[PDB]
Amino acid sequence: YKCGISKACPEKHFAFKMASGAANVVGPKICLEDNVLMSGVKNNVGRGINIALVNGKTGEVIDTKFFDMWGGDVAPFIEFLKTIQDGTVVLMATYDDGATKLTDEARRLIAELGSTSITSLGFRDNWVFCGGKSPFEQHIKNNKETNKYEGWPEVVEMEGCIPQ
Structure with a gap:
């Protein structure tokens, strides 16, 4: 029941629960092992793609950031994606729009984390993904x-168990 998930997770697994934002008014939410990583109440979410990096062994947060895919620049998003190391769990959730500023390179970089829906992501589509340097992807x-x-x-919305 960690994160408020319906079914319990087995050994060497991290429980996770995530949701995209609602329109441009309710921010996305990312929870892992009953710890809220990103949310509106935490005030660390924003329009675009919201990304949480988690240590693949301990299950603790490394970093959380969001990138405006409507009005922002794709270059800092591309730089941030290139910094992700092997073993890191990456959780991504859209808020409002996560596609307008996407480039083929940005999409290729997300696809390398295990994403099949990123290539086809369009204007205002909602999308949640849990991968790493799949599955767990919903849109x-x-x-x-x-x-x-x-x-x-x-x-x-998406919930599940990530292997340690």
């Missing part, structure tokens, strides 16, 4: 005919 496409919100899809 909801931005679709005007189906969207819960006026211009944005519903929050996408």
